[PDB]
Enzyme design. Structure first.
Site, short mmCIF file in Angstrom:
data_model
loop_
_atom_site.label_atom_id
_atom_site.label_comp_id
_atom_site.label_asym_id
_atom_site.label_seq_id
_atom_site.Cartn_x
_atom_site.Cartn_y
_atom_site.Cartn_z
N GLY A 191 16.16 7.05 -6.52
CA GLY A 191 16.74 7.12 -5.19
C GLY A 191 18.24 7.34 -5.29
N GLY A 214 0.77 -1.23 0.00
CA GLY A 214 0.00 0.00 0.00
C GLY A 214 0.81 1.29 0.00
N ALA A 215 2.13 1.19 0.16
CA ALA A 215 2.97 2.38 0.26
C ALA A 215 3.46 2.77 -1.12
CB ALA A 215 4.16 2.16 1.19
N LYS A 216 3.86 4.04 -1.27
CA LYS A 216 4.41 4.52 -2.53
C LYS A 216 5.92 4.75 -2.39
CE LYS A 216 0.05 6.68 -3.80
NZ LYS A 216 -0.53 7.82 -4.57
N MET A 217 6.66 4.27 -3.39
CA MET A 217 8.12 4.32 -3.38
C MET A 217 8.62 5.22 -4.52
SD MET A 217 10.60 1.00 -3.53
CE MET A 217 12.38 1.09 -3.29
N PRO A 218 9.44 6.23 -4.20
CA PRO A 218 10.02 7.09 -5.24
C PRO A 218 10.86 6.30 -6.24
CG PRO A 218 10.30 8.06 -3.05
CD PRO A 218 9.84 6.64 -2.84
N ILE A 219 10.65 6.54 -7.54
CA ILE A 219 11.31 5.72 -8.55
C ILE A 219 12.79 6.06 -8.72
CG2 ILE A 219 9.12 5.41 -9.77
CD1 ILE A 219 10.07 7.36 -11.85
N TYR A 223 27.57 -1.23 3.91
CA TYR A 223 28.24 -0.08 3.26
C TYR A 223 29.03 0.74 4.28
CZ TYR A 223 24.97 -1.20 -0.53
OH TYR A 223 24.23 -1.86 -1.50
N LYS A 238 19.36 -2.90 4.34
CA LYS A 238 19.48 -4.30 3.94
C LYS A 238 20.12 -5.13 5.05
CE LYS A 238 20.48 -2.54 -0.75
NZ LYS A 238 21.42 -1.42 -0.35
N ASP A 288 19.08 4.69 -0.69
CA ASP A 288 19.35 3.25 -0.55
C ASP A 288 20.61 3.04 0.28
OD1 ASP A 288 18.81 0.34 -1.55
OD2 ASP A 288 20.95 0.66 -1.99
N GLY A 302 21.96 6.05 -4.40
CA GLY A 302 22.76 4.94 -3.92
C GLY A 302 23.91 5.40 -3.03
N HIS A 307 19.73 -8.75 1.89
CA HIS A 307 20.73 -8.24 0.95
C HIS A 307 21.16 -9.25 -0.13
CE1 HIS A 307 24.12 -5.00 0.78
NE2 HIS A 307 23.80 -5.43 -0.43
N1 LIG Z 1 21.68 -4.91 -3.51
C1 LIG Z 1 22.94 -5.02 -3.92
O1 LIG Z 1 23.56 -6.07 -3.83
C2 LIG Z 1 23.62 -3.82 -4.53
C3 LIG Z 1 24.78 -4.00 -5.26
C4 LIG Z 1 25.39 -2.89 -5.83
C5 LIG Z 1 24.82 -1.64 -5.63
N2 LIG Z 1 23.69 -1.47 -4.92
C6 LIG Z 1 23.08 -0.12 -4.72
O2 LIG Z 1 22.91 0.60 -5.96
C7 LIG Z 1 23.66 1.82 -5.89
C8 LIG Z 1 24.23 2.29 -7.22
O3 LIG Z 1 25.05 1.29 -7.84
P1 LIG Z 1 26.65 1.43 -7.82
O4 LIG Z 1 27.11 2.32 -6.68
O5 LIG Z 1 27.19 0.02 -7.94
O6 LIG Z 1 27.05 2.12 -9.24
P2 LIG Z 1 26.34 3.22 -10.18
O7 LIG Z 1 25.30 4.04 -9.47
O8 LIG Z 1 25.95 2.49 -11.45
O9 LIG Z 1 27.63 4.13 -10.48
C9 LIG Z 1 28.20 4.98 -9.47
C10 LIG Z 1 29.50 5.56 -10.02
O10 LIG Z 1 29.24 6.36 -11.17
C11 LIG Z 1 29.71 7.70 -10.96
N3 LIG Z 1 28.69 8.65 -11.44
C12 LIG Z 1 27.54 8.96 -10.81
N4 LIG Z 1 26.84 9.87 -11.51
C13 LIG Z 1 27.54 10.18 -12.62
C14 LIG Z 1 27.35 11.09 -13.77
N5 LIG Z 1 26.23 11.86 -13.90
N6 LIG Z 1 28.33 11.11 -14.69
C15 LIG Z 1 29.44 10.35 -14.58
N7 LIG Z 1 29.69 9.50 -13.56
C16 LIG Z 1 28.77 9.38 -12.56
C17 LIG Z 1 29.91 7.85 -9.46
O11 LIG Z 1 30.98 8.74 -9.22
P3 LIG Z 1 30.99 9.79 -7.98
O12 LIG Z 1 30.26 9.06 -6.87
O13 LIG Z 1 32.48 9.96 -7.75
O14 LIG Z 1 30.31 11.04 -8.50
C18 LIG Z 1 30.30 6.44 -9.10
O15 LIG Z 1 31.65 6.28 -9.52
C19 LIG Z 1 24.74 1.54 -4.87
O16 LIG Z 1 25.29 2.75 -4.37
C20 LIG Z 1 23.96 0.77 -3.84
O17 LIG Z 1 23.12 1.72 -3.15
C21 LIG Z 1 23.08 -2.54 -4.37
#
Ligand SMILES: NC(=O)c1ccc[n+]([C@@H]2O[C@H](COP(=O)([O-])OP(=O)(O)OC[C@H]3O[C@@H](n4cnc5c(N)ncnc54)[C@H](OP(=O)(O)O)[C@@H]3O)[C@@H](O)[C@H]2O)c1
Ligand SMILES: CC(=C\c1ccccc1)/C=C1/SC(=S)N(CC(=O)O)C1=O
Length: 316
Positions: A17, A10-15, A49, A78, A44, A19, A111
């Site tokens: 977010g 029933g909740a709404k999640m912003p598309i 982390y 997570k 997130d 990381g 996670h």
């Molecule tokens: N559930 C899981 O197992 C899992 C696994 C991986 C990730 N995640 C989540 O998803 C989030 C995002 O994924 P991610 O951190 O792996 O990688 P991502 O968001 O695909 O990429 C982040 C990287 O891209 C750079 N970046 C960001 N915006 C940019 C832009 N406009 N132009 C150029 N470069 C840019 C950032 O640099 P700067 O930060 O230096 O600007 C950082 O180096 C994570 O932070 C985490 O919250 C979850």
């Protein structure tokens, strides 16, 4: 393009977010503050982390400043792998809540489906370089997650990195109380997740796409690796729309009815990444970006390929 999706609780999640994986503790507070100022309402997080306290500082100060109120934020964390034991779940959640300085989470995810030996190592490995598992299974851990909802510590529960068989296992669980609200998985043009997405959405489970930019700051990055952000085919689509390659890679999952969570600690990029509600990818753009799939994972959890619950042997 509406800014939030309805969850099965029933909740709404912003598309869109923010990381926070790889966001250093000394930088993530500012990152989260700027994010909130420019319109992000979804952050997130994860205990693994190791920056949840500093994320908490940002949220607390924006609340204090009357910039946003709690009801308007959607905070996600997570459960780490060493806490899959039913008796350990509540404790790990409370640690995260304490760090984040929150009364509740809007969403708490398992996670990874893989349970690790409990203790003080995030990744207990043995001599073969393989993880030391815990005698845990996803269904009992899920029951423990369900209890967090009943007790009001979290408003929704979900999973992350679960394959469709693992999702199905929970959906068919004897005595199931709450269906997973969300399955957060890696998703981008080199890993399109068509079948897993179609499955989840057919079941009313919302999918969050992680590493949408291809995680160029990932620890294991090599020059020979493919690079989404430098893919000339993608740069071309970006140029056609007068947007950055990043904005294209963020808009892509949005148009698939996915939640997306790009990470940045750079104020200019944090703002740039949010500016994706002012254009559309064409039908052919979407088809073409989908055609780029090559089953390429940033996060393959390689030290766990022998774990009984390793998720990436299955096709999807
Ligand atoms: N559930 C899981 O197992 C899992 C696994 C991986 C990730 N995640 C989540 O998803 C989030 C995002 O994924 P991610 O951190 O792996 O990688 P991502 O968001 O695909 O990429 C982040 C990287 O891209 C750079 N970046 C960001 N915006 C940019 C832009 N406009 N132009 C150029 N470069 C840019 C950032 O640099 P700067 O930060 O230096 O600007 C950082 O180096 C994570 O932070 C985490 O919250 C979850
Ligand atoms: C070593 C710790 C890791 S490996 C990996 S992929 N991630 C991202 C995630 O699980 O969300 C980590 O935090």
């Amino acid at each position: 393009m509406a800014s939030r999706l309805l969850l099965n609780n029933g909740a709404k999640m912003p598309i869109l977010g923010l990381g926070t994986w790889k966001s250093p503790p000394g930088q993530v507070t500012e990152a989260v503050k700027v994010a909130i100022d420019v319109g992000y309402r979804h952050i997130d997080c994860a205990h693994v982390y190791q920056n949840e306290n500093e994320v908490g500082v940002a949220i607390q100060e924006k609340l204090r400043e009357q910039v946003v109120k709690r009801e308007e934020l959607f905070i996600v964390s997570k459960l780490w792998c060493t806490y899959h034991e039913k008796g350990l779940v509540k404790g790990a959640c409370q640690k995260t809540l304490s760090d984040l300085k929150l009364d509740y989470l809007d969403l708490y995810l398992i996670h990874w489906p893989t349970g690790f030996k409990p203790g003080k190592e995030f990744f207990p490995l043995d001599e073969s370089g393989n993880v030391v598992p815990s005698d845990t299974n996803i269904l009992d851990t899920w029951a423990a997650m369900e209890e967090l909802v009943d007790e009001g510590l979290v408003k929704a529960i979900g999973i992350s990195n679960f394959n469709h068989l693992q999702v199905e296992m929970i959906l068919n669980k004897p005595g199931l109380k709450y269906k997973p609200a969300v399955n957060q998985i890696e998703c981008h043009p080199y890993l399109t997740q068509e079948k897993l997405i179609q499955y989840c959405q057919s079941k009313g489970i919302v999918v969050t796409a992680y590493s949408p930019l291809g995680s160029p700051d990932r620890p294991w990055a090599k020059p020979e690796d493919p690079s989404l952000l430098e893919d000339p085919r993608i740069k071309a689509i970006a140029a056609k729309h007068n947007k950055t390659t990043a904005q294209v890679l963020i808009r892509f999952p949005m148009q698939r009815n996915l939640v997306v969570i790009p990470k940045s600690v750079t104020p200019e990029r944090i703002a740039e990444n949010f500016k994706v509600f002012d254009f559309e990818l064409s039908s052919q753009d979407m088809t073409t970006l989908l055609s780029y799939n090559r089953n390429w994972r940033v996060c393959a959890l390689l030290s766990c390929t022998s774990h009984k619950d390793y998720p990436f042997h299955e096709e999807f």
